[PDB]
Design an enzyme around this catalytic site. Sequence first.
Site, PDB file in Angstrom:
ATOM      1  CB  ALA A 230      -0.958   0.001   1.201  1.00  0.00           C
ATOM      2  CG  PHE A 231      -0.854   5.306   0.269  1.00  0.00           C
ATOM      3  CD1 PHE A 231      -0.457   6.348   1.100  1.00  0.00           C
ATOM      4  CD2 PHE A 231      -2.120   4.771   0.437  1.00  0.00           C
ATOM      5  CE1 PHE A 231      -1.298   6.842   2.069  1.00  0.00           C
ATOM      6  CE2 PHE A 231      -2.962   5.262   1.400  1.00  0.00           C
ATOM      7  CZ  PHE A 231      -2.553   6.298   2.221  1.00  0.00           C
TER       8      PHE A 231
ATOM      9  CE  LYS B 235      -0.966  -4.059  -7.157  1.00  0.00           C
ATOM     10  NZ  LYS B 235      -0.827  -2.550  -7.256  1.00  0.00           N
TER      11      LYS B 235
ATOM     12  N   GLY C  37      -3.486  -3.725   2.456  1.00  0.00           N
ATOM     13  CA  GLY C  37      -4.318  -2.663   1.915  1.00  0.00           C
ATOM     14  C   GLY C  37      -5.645  -2.591   2.632  1.00  0.00           C
ATOM     15  CB  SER C  38      -8.790  -0.983   1.554  1.00  0.00           C
ATOM     16  OG  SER C  38      -9.204  -1.667   0.386  1.00  0.00           O
TER      17      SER C  38
ATOM     18  CD  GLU D 125      -0.071  -8.029   8.366  1.00  0.00           C
ATOM     19  OE1 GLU D 125      -0.367  -7.008   9.032  1.00  0.00           O
ATOM     20  OE2 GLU D 125       0.558  -9.014   8.826  1.00  0.00           O
TER      21      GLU D 125
ATOM     22  CB  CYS E 281      -2.193  -0.249   9.277  1.00  0.00           C
ATOM     23  SG  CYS E 281      -1.835  -0.330   7.502  1.00  0.00           S
ATOM     24  CB  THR E 282      -0.466   1.051  13.985  1.00  0.00           C
ATOM     25  OG1 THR E 282       0.518   1.954  13.459  1.00  0.00           O
ATOM     26  CG2 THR E 282      -0.128  -0.369  13.537  1.00  0.00           C
TER      27      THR E 282
ATOM     28  CB  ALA F  67       4.715  -2.918  16.402  1.00  0.00           C
TER      29      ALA F  67
END
EC number: 1.2.1.31
Lengths: 507, 509, 508, 508
Positions: A162-163, A187, A243-244, A265, A299-300, A459
């Site tokens: 992801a970005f 990718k 990603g989402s 994830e 994400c966190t 983490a």
Amino acid sequence: LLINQPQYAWLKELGLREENEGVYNGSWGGRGEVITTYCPANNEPIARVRQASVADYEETVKKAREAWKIWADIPAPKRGEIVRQIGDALREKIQVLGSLVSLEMGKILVEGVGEVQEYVDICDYAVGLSRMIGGPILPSERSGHALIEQWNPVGLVGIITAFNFPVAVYGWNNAIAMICGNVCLWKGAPTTSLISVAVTKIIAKVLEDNKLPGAICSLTCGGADIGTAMAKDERVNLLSFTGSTQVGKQVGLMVQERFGRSLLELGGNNAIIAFEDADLSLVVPSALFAAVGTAGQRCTTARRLFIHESIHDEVVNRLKKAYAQIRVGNPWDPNVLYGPLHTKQAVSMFLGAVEEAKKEGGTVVYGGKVMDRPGNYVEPTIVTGLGHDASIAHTDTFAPILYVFKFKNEEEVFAWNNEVKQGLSSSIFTKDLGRIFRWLGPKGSDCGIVNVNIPTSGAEIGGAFGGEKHTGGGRESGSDAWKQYMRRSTCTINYSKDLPLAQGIKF
Amino acid sequence: TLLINQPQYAWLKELGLREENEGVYNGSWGGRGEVITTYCPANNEPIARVRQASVADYEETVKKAREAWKIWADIPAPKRGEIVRQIGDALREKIQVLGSLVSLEMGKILVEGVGEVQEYVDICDYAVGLSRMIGGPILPSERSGHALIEQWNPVGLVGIITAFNFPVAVYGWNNAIAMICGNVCLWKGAPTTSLISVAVTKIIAKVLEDNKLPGAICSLTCGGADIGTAMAKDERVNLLSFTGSTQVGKQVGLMVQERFGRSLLELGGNNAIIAFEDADLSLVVPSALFAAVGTAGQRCTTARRLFIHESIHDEVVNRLKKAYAQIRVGNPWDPNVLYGPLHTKQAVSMFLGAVEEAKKEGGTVVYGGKVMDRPGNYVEPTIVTGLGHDASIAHTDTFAPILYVFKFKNEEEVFAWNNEVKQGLSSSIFTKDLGRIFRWLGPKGSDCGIVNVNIPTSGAEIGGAFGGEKHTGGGRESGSDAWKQYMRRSTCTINYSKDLPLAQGIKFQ
Amino acid sequence: TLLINQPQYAWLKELGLREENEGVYNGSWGGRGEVITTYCPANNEPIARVRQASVADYEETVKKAREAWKIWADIPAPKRGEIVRQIGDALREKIQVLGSLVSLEMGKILVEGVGEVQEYVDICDYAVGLSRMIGGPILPSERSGHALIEQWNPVGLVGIITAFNFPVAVYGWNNAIAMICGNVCLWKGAPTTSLISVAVTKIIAKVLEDNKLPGAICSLTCGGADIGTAMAKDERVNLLSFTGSTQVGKQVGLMVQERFGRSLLELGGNNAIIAFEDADLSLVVPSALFAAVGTAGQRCTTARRLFIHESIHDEVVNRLKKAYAQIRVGNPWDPNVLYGPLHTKQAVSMFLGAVEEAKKEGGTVVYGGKVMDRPGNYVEPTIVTGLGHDASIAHTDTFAPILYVFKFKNEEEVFAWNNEVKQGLSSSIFTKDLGRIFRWLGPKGSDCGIVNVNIPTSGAEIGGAFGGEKHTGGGRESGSDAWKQYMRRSTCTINYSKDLPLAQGIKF
Amino acid sequence: TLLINQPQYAWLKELGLREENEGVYNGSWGGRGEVITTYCPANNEPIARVRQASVADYEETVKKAREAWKIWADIPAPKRGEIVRQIGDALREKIQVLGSLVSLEMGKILVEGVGEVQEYVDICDYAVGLSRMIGGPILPSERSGHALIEQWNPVGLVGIITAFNFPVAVYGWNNAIAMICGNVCLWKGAPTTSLISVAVTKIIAKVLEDNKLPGAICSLTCGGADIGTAMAKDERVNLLSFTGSTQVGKQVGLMVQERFGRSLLELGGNNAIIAFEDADLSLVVPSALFAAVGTAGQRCTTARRLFIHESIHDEVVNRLKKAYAQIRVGNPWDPNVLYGPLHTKQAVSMFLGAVEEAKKEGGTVVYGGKVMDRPGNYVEPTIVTGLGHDASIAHTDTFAPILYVFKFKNEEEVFAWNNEVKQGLSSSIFTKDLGRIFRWLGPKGSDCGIVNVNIPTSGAEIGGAFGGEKHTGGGRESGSDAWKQYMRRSTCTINYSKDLPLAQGIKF
Ligand SMILES: [Cl-]
Ligand SMILES: [Cl-]
């Protein structure tokens, strides 16, 4: 193009040009659509990448699986040596690579550099693990039999990233998958194509200097079309997807449909909980940095702040006084703490989420507005007065909006932490010994990361990283996360001349 | 008349079985769903009936199991291990009659029925020790004044769907592990082995009630596709362990993935034995015989494909034909009987179908291929030669005692042929070559989850993890660290210091 | 007259004991050595007699055990685990009379005597699963076509020397683990618990004989320092596990090192409890009482030293004083009894000497200090205040229920005082402070093998490794990977390839 | 004239060496003990001098190391790993000149000098990952509201005594593991490799100093038996890792045992290769040659005993003789040299004695057996046939390049003969038989710490634990969980509940 402006000449230290090939498999290419990536700090175009066509994808998969035949035969410790050299090549480029992360993605320089250091660190860790991976030799119940748990590479590991962590998440997957004897197909996020190319160039040189086929670490830049191909491709033995939740759900179903392996994830809707006995001089900075870090695009990221009623209003007021001091600026500039959002659309999402939060009774007590400067800058925002189950606080938008809630007792706020669909990270701030161990126990947090007196972003590579529930169940990095990249076999060698049967069955 | 009402079978009462039994247990017994009658495959006679669960029965049971979980998860794992120990003892005390019920309702021979109950006793005794060991490492944090801890907690409710061919052991593997791991269990067994499920649940229910524990810790909801589909779609089922067909397992895996649940899939095998030119044939022939005809070819790990090197092909086939002829057939409870009936009438019909299609595809039946003329669902264990390794009939998931024999020349191709099937459960080679053995065990070797040398494909012990790759579904049961699939990992950082984070130029108070 | 000949103790026969018992078992029972009489410490009357091992008995027993090992080592670990499971059941069945024998011969209260048998039962059931797990990793070799495997094999003959104070469980810990690891065992228990050793050996021997295994797998040679010294000097004893005094354990350790053997030493402890100011005193006071007075102060993990913070020192001593006065004393088999007799007459004489010396060094006896005027070896459980933490009497290893109470101010000094003694078995702090707890567990915390928080110094469980550091001798028993001490590791490289070595210019 | 003062050896100054070097490092450099001169065994010329440690030097160094430990133990293990990573890199940058120094002062061929440094590099890189892994299990307590945790903490000061024959790698193994485990180290190398020890220590000292760490984390006290004995007796040395002779190592074990310290002993090997009838001879002959004559036969793992089945015995010996004649002897730094000098003049006369003793005892020198007529300590690599397996010279512990060759008939006797020697380091069989290979690895197989198949006795890699059994001393270095020998285990129970113990009738 920024790369054509003298202020950004350092981009050529990463081998980047005006137009870059976004396919690597031993050879560089790219017959798909050309994508221009933009610097979110000024909305200016940086450079262009020629993405993968389907023909490029096919050629790359075939060459990576050919490469696997060579690489799988290389002893794991010698694979670790290759990964060590990748760590060193990353070490040599850490400043410029980190600067590119700040330029193309938007996070502040210390975090861009920190992301490369994390990949460096996972490489150095993987070196030791490459002499350790394996299973037990177990005592068979039968005379003259050996019982061995073997682990072997799954083959081709596809990696979709992801970005928001355009280097470290790939690095986690790459280092571990490599030492485990897999080849990799990457990718990356389209809007971080330059980062993907730069990283891939660094790795390709190590592979080539060691006269290894480059397709061991293949790259096929692309969007949903290439990612969907990977998810559908029986030749991709493991698909690691970051990603989402909406995309990851479809990816998991496509992989499951072909009885593949997936490592998912996905989102986090992470909460911090400050109990009455908490050190507020620890709570206030922990919450601020966990909410505003990376402009709330981790994400966190701390999205939900539960504060006990007795201290709620004090913590909010100290947060406001500390939010007012956050230094906003260009993400590469010194002492900047807060940069832009990644895209113009995320600014639109920020505005939509702010309007809806107020429409549900929330009070914007800080921020809530777009900043009147170039780039995708929005104010870090604090919203109070919503109920825990409010619709806006269970929506998933990468926005720097901190929803603050009151609570009164331990059992109810644990349930509130657990009530959301995702399950990535969680933190409590308390001194109560019993409370801490309950939080860590079966009636505590349901998350993959369960922290105490440290925020939702604490983490380190030593442990497995990932979540439960709609976070998707995958783990990366430490502990025995490496088993997800390998195939377990339970092997029995009969070296005798009789046939004793298990469970003493006489046949 | 029903077998349980005939004096010949008075022993079924020793398992608590009646003419009509309740197929739902959640601390109380009941069932408002469809009544099913199961039949003895040795004589096609009805044994007894079971009132299965309705959707509402299942709804009520999930609620009571999750209520029971609040109690059970608070019980220290070693004390949960003690309850499992007592289950293993309670099974030991009934091992013969339970083994007989397995032989009666399922149809495998007595020593295999008792052997399957012994698998459950063994995993119980194993789980007792494991209950004092499960958990993760405390790790060195890179941060001063921080502890880094890997915690493992129960997922909650473990739904366990099992099949007819192992109606005791597979549930037992899942149950003993899930229990010590602090989960409650909900069991939907195979409809045609409902009495076995009731009998097992009655043994467990007494242990739980004698320990004043809520019975829903080991719930039973007998039913078919309706109940299983409900479990696959039930977000309250935290882990769904499914053993059964690849086709159904595929849909179950999808339904669990759609709701971001956990599944543990144990699906079919199309398992090969490969005999190389240097193989000890006095091991090859008895192994291939047991692997193919054990349980009348109805195991997940049954040998379906026998690859024999060209040099020894005819000799091995001839010896296998002779050994097949010496197979003692009879009632599966009878003495010295080594071959019983198939589980259903349908399996007989499909068996004859497969035999005919294999002929139509160019195979030669060198032994068997016919129904046995006797009561029950008996067919001749069957050997087919002459097919290509890619023959369509040999890549059909049929649960029939038909062994497909292939020739091969070199090692690389036959390894690829072992691997070319959709499933990836078990595999075995017979050879003496050290280098060949480690190649078979290595990355270019067998792609299966069970990788054997000089033993049959079937008959795993409990010490290792059990399961397959590819279309076998990927799950693992029993030994090694299989227990982790029944628990959720958390990575936990505890800041125990007075240290404050770097102010980063911000003036705090 | 022998207690075993009196009607009130007829149950002793259920354990297969008679008036004179054979103290050697190697598949056959015997004993040509000196006959010892063991005494009930509750009344000083003789219970029964045991014929101990002569040195010729020992020599024959070692020979038979090593012969038995050839059979036993070839039995797959999980089937050895089934033998251990059956031992656990055989113990389960005699748990009441064997527990009662521990109380009769040793002196501890029945609930602890029964619980010691249950501990053996528990480690047996633990060892059943561990028998399917022992081993090492298969590791990735750096060499192409090479397997790297860590193998574990039995060391062979495990000598086990145990003490009087845990006459069943310590042997049981060593037995269950050594047995699933493929070793044969030779047991020399404490002379004063010879009946218990015979009774345990009889139970195990029945299991072995019923499974048609050589009895010498679990051999017994009752005896004293003569047999223990022979074991310590015997190259055929591949591992000597020794539980006992530090003085004797030191000499055992040197004898084994002299012959390049393996030892496992479980020696004394001088275990401290530390009560910080923020401690839950309703947790501290009962924990301290039961850890100091349990087994009449005769456990290796007995609380010897109670450091109390100056702020709460007087309240805790006063609360402890009122609690000691309520300890119910009586025969160790009577149900209401919490406190039994000391194990020997000599222990009474030495207890009185420890009390008098403690007073001479400035201590005040705030409770106890005296013998009780009833039959047997009963003394009052004793509390001594006022001494300095370095008082010499506090650092004497005496198995007497005497609890030395010290004051302290801060955490750094009191951690140092926990660590200043020669031994390092168990230790406990009582506190609610999160950072103090993790410092206690960290490199600047307790130096002991058992490091407890908000629980007393005794009562460990089988899941973890049990044992101490420093003069406690370093051995570990029971849980975690303590089984590795009973096996030999080998690092094994298997070249399965056809690769020739590099010729280095030589024509081969 | 000192070699270091001759222009062609100017490269020695790249390692910071000069005519006379300080042999004490503890943050400061010093050395008030006796000056030692080390010699180049290729030509018997003096190289340079080292001022060794006096007792005062030792005392000050122990004090400074124990002070440094208070800092070092508080640094997170992964940050300690990062220091060890930089040590690895610092060694990388000196690998060529340091390898050359190993060849100059110790005498092994250059590829082995470099290879030994590379082994230290590799264990550093391995320890970097291990530093994020060391620890124990969190276990399920049987009691409600209790956490059960196995903690591991540094022992403190690890003293490391090493030998001449691996003057870099053995210290490296101990150093990297002890460091990530949170210990400080004190190194006393072999006196005859004092310059190697100084050079290594300079490389590490610069890393510690660049990271603002107290240098005494990796202290050096050059010396001989007097300093080693002090370490063996010093209670402040928490673990004493000793590599050397069995005779000295036994006394070191006794001395450490006397004080209840920990030792890690890596002593002699008397290592056998066994070639069965079915062995691949194209693999056996070079494997035996390189394992026997490697390092002029001065490895712990050198092949000393070669058992050949009677059918293939003479053929193997003949092929060994043809290949032995092709061994290229020369200066150990010269290209394509396979074989260099013995370490000392003393070792040459020992060689001479053993050759005549083998002759007197009934052996036949089929190759070699004579001293070579050139500068240095060169002797011919020697093959001796005709001795019985129990011949007394084949059970003598000589670092001589003498390969004793024996006949055998069956598997059982030759396994027993492998096992009959006092040491138990390394062992190798060559065979294709699958059952035999697993018997060799099993409980009736080889009793050694290293048990190899179709690869000779020097087959060892850092991923596995390295060491042996019986008189080899029992220690393990490098891989698997060898790290646990450098740490202390504690079993920790935390009661986090408000639950009170049973009052048991008492009114608290
Ligand atoms: Cl503040
Ligand atoms: Cl040759």
